[PDB]
Design a protein around this nucleic acid. Structure first.
Ligand SMILES: [Mg+2]
Ligand SMILES: [Mg+2]
Ligand SMILES: [Mg+2]
Ligand SMILES: [Mg+2]
Ligand SMILES: [Mg+2]
Ligand SMILES: [Mg+2]
Ligand SMILES: [Mg+2]
Ligand SMILES: [Mg+2]
Ligand SMILES: [Mg+2]
Ligand SMILES: [Mg+2]
Ligand SMILES: [Mg+2]
Ligand SMILES: [Mg+2]
Ligand SMILES: [Mg+2]
Ligand SMILES: [Mg+2]
Ligand SMILES: [Mg+2]
Lengths: 194, 170, 188, 134
RNA sequence: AGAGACCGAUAGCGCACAAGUAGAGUGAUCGAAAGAUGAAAAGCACUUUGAAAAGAGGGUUAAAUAGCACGUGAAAUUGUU
């Protein structure tokens, strides 16, 4: 029920795909960066505990990326966190949510045990992280380059006006003809590309 | 990586040997100094020292400042290098680098595929008449260039000597 | 086409709207009662469709790409939902379409005090509610395939055929957009 | 295993014939399977693809895309499907070539000729099944 | 027409290609070299410097150090460090 809101609000959840699983009940789903990670973490204990939790369960996340979309390289730093969100029952029957809470508390131990993966799995995730970092610095560079390109365009127009103003009549005529001829030459060179 | 601009040209019909000598002459220099020196070479006011490809070349007084006797004025090579340096300047300006502090950090001249012509010899013979074009590649970088374990496996006798000496001294 | 059918119906309805007496408050109130009855019936069938959806409780996973705002140059968005949630959302958009129609009707009849569209407005919303996609798949029971494929295209008219681009269920694209990292946008 | 002396299992000959086949032979080469519904309806498994057929792509990066066959480029052994396209550098849209064996025919363009074809195939298949079941 | 314990682009016919072609000889005759981007041209839009060729950004692609001097890319020989 909560896949939409999880994907939209959670930046880190948006870095993963969403696949079903035959082990899980048809109202649950797994979000991961690697099927190997899904195999290593989707334990029968967790599956049974989530089944016991039922519809009160909202989501359970193991992450190193922030909740909100970062905008700087200093922002995009790993920070290991385990998150468990769930709705509160009206009848206060918390025994069903006890398996989730217990397994959540023991999550760091299980993760220290089994969350070590071969370099191929690590290379799969760090590629995505590098792509995100590159996307951030990309937009930084586009903003800076756009500002300096506006400055350079203004300087070009100023130079054209300043030098074209004081030429002779025939000098201005020849200059305009040269501009037109060069523009046409470059347009034809672009048009002649195969 | 981000404080550098680069330029290159390929299959340039200019003498590879002369271009290599000129590039070696301007290697490691400031950009403005290199441009001025190349224009001076074109004007025959400064000379490029001929060091590797200098067999049976001439001697000049302008080679004194390089410590050599054989120096020349490869005008065509100087013009090609001026064009490439200007392209690198334009790239640095577009990137936003401070063009007044650029240094020729990398410069390399390689041999390009040779172009074929014929020459005619005595007794009805034909000999090759080849040109030796070059690829040129250069990288300018902003200049900062301001640069400003313990004994672990001693023996027991060495450690005892150290301890005794330390106790005796203080 | 629905356009031609609606226009044909109007060709007789707005004739009857100029011949039935409208100076009579009794006849006006009878027409108002018919209009309110049609509105309540479409309430009923919307609620029944929602009930059928909830009874089915289909949990099949669905993914698609919503386009940018019409005519805009913005990036698209990825929606991964369940078919249950999509059916609920489209029932609710039918409800919002109702509320918009009711508001416009009340505005033109009570504030501006116009009376001509009453006969056509008592029919066309009901006909559209009966002919809607879920009034087909759930009320009538025809399978949701072909033109009844889940991510229904934009309900626009000719400008809809121009700018209301179809929702993409492309497996190649959905996978590309799925791991783009576009969540956690600062609402601001 | 081949037995008949007229059949040859030469890889060189097979490749030469395939890549120099004339247009009429390429038509048969570029056959596509029918959908399950059409297969049940007509008792026909495969048919040569035709412009105006409606197909669904079941292989490649464009899986699950549906559309009408807009061109059958025999010279390139590909078909063009509506809205299964790509963008050049200029942003101009060009069709993407799809092999007909990578698609399934979901709706057929039917005219007496395309149908005499289906009746012939159906009659042959039914007769063969009956003879084998004798 | 079918095959092979055959050869695999300096091999196999001189010719895997617009090869008995291009070219040579007055002529009879002589007679080459030359295959491979990518699954798909998707064969690089656009900005900028340059007279131009081109370069630098940027884009396509799984990959451009796969960019029509295109699979891989040795040695001789060469440049820079
Ligand atoms: Mg010597
Ligand atoms: Mg001597
Ligand atoms: Mg001499
Ligand atoms: Mg002679
Ligand atoms: Mg030589
Ligand atoms: Mg040969
Ligand atoms: Mg060869
Ligand atoms: Mg030969
Ligand atoms: Mg001749
Ligand atoms: Mg090759
Ligand atoms: Mg690239
Ligand atoms: Mg390589
Ligand atoms: Mg390669
Ligand atoms: Mg290569
Ligand atoms: Mg070597």
């Amino acid at each position: 029920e909560c896949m939409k809101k999880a994907r939209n609000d959670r930046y880190d959840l948006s870095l993963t795909y969403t696949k079903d699983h035959a082990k899980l009940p048809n109202w649950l789903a797994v979000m991961s960066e690697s099927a190997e990670i899904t195999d290593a973490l989707l334990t029968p204990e967790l599956i049974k505990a989530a089944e016991a939790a039922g519809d009160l369960f909202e989501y359970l996340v193991v992450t190193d990326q922030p909740e909100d979309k970062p905008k700087t390289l200093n922002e995009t730093r790993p920070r290991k966190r385990v998150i468990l969100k769930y709705r509160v029952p009206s009848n206060d029957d918390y025994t069903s949510l006890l398996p989730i809470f217990e397994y959540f508390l023991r999550m760091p131990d299980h993760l220290v045990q089994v969350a070590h993966f071969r370099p191929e799995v690590l290379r799969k995730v760090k590629v995505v992280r590098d792509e995100e970092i590159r996307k951030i610095q990309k937009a930084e560079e586009e903003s800076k380059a756009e500002e300096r390109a506006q400055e350079r365009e203004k300087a070009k127009k100023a130079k054209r006006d300043q030098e074209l103003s004081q030429l002779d009549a025939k000098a201005q005529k020849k200059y305009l003809e040269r501009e037109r001829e060069k523009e046409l030459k470059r347009s034809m060179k672009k048009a002649t590309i195969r | 990586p981000t404080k550098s601009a680069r330029a290159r040209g390929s299959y340039l019909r200019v003498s590879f040997k002369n271009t290599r000598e000129t590039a070696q002459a301007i290697n490691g220099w400031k950009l403005q100094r290199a441009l001025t020196f190349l224009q001076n070479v074109i004007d025959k006011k400064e000379a490029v020292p001929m060091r590797r490809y200098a067999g049976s070349t001439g001697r000049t007084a302008q080679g004194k400042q390089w410590g050599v006797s054989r120096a020349r004025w490869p005008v065509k090579s100087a013009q090609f290098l001026i064009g490439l340096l200007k392209n690198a300047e334009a790239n640095a300006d577009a990137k936003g680098l401070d063009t007044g502090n650029l240094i020729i950090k990398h410069i390399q001249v390689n041999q390009a595929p040779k172009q074929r012509r014929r020459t005619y010899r005595a007794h009805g013979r034909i000999n090759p008449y080849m040109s030796n074009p070059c690829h040129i590649e250069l990288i300018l970088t902003e200049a900062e260039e301001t640069v400003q374990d313990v004994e672990s496996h001693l023996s027991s006798r060495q450690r005892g000597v150290r301890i005794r000496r330390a106790l005796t001294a203080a | 086409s629905p356009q031609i059918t609606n226009l044909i119906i109007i060709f007789g309805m707005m004739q009857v709207s100029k011949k039935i007496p409208f100076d009579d408050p009794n006849v006006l109130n009878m027409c108002r009662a018919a209009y309110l009855a049609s509105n309540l019936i479409i309430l009923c069938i919307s609620l029944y469709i929602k009930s059928v959806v909830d009874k089915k409780k289909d949990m099949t996973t669905l993914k698609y790409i919503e386009p940018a705002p019409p005519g805009s140059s913005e990036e698209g968005k990825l929606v991964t939902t369940t078919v249950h949630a999509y059916d609920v959302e489209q029932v609710k958009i039918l409800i919002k379409s109702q509320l918009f129609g009711i508001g416009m009707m009340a505005f033109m009849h009570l504030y501006l005090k116009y009376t001509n569209p009453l006969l056509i407005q008592s029919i066309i919303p009901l006909k559209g509610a009966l002919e809607s996609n879920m009034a087909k798949i759930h009320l009538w029971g025809m399978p949701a395939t072909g033109d009844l494929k889940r991510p229904f295209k934009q309900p626009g008219g000719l400008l809809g055929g121009l700018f209301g681009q179809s929702v993409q269920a492309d497996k190649k694209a959905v996978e590309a957009a799925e791991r783009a990292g576009r969540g956690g946008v600062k609402e601001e | 295993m081949k037995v008949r002396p007229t059949v040859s299992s030469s890889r060189r000959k097979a490749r030469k014939a395939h890549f120099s086949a004339p247009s009429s032979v390429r038509r048969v080469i570029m056959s596509a399977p029918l959908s399950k519904e059409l297969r049940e309806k007509y008792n026909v498994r495969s048919i040569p693809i035709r412009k105006g057929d409606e197909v669904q792509i079941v292989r490649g990066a464009h899986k699950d895309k549906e559309g009408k066959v807009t061109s059958v480029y025999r010279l390139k052994y590909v078909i063009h499907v509506e809205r299964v396209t790509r963008e050049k550098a200029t942003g101009q849209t060009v069709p993407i070539g799809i092999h007909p064996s990578n698609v399934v025919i979901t709706k057929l363009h039917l005219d007496k000729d395309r149908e005499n074809i289906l009746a012939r195939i159906k009659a042959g298949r039914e007769q063969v099944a009956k003879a084998k079941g004798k």
